[PDB]
Design a protein around this ligand. Sequence first.
Ligand SMILES: O=C(Nc1ccc2c(c1)CNC2)c1cccc2[nH]c(=O)[nH]c12
Lengths: 39, 156
Amino acid sequence: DMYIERAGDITWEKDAEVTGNSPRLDVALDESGDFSLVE
Amino acid sequence: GETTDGVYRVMTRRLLGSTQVGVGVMQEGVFHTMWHVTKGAALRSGEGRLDPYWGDVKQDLVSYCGPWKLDAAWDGLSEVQLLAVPPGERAKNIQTLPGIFKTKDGDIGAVALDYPAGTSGSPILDKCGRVIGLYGNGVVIKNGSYVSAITQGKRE
Ligand SMILES: O=C(Nc1ccc2c(c1)CNC2)c1cccc2[nH]c(=O)[nH]c12
């Protein structure tokens, strides 16, 4: 049996660590809610 | 039990010790998370019980106590913040510029940040702190890393 615990507030924080790229990927979503890369 | 707005960890004692299976958002008396986290099972909050209200395996979303409340959207131009809540690790805002998942039914926002599967359900925020979607459903790119979509539900 699953349970929940508070982990914090939802707020935007200035000066947060800015990382990560922005790729344009061709995808397909199946009936089971799974993505797949189409090439 | 606890119904204060904010971000929450989804845990389980079914396995060895206490294992985090995902994350969720509590907003307007409704708990929002990814379907693959709970599989639609009921949740506990102290003495209180949260029962599923709506869910869909294709959208990979599920709400507890009431209908889906989150309706903010990525504008296509601005940076967003992933409020990553990692297993055993403290909550942390990670700013990034999202990419695009090009699909047969339209384009979707996508965050290219690799986090453990147990981080599934972590909210993605706009410059106002609004929940524009959840992290946890995407694809494995040529580099082995995960690129999750910005999964938003519908507010009826
Ligand atoms: O596996 C993940 N997500 C998932 C799993 C099962 C299902 C769905 C999504 C939707 N339909 C069922 C996942 C989420 C966050 C980071 C990850 N890194 C990694 O390698 N996998 C993930």
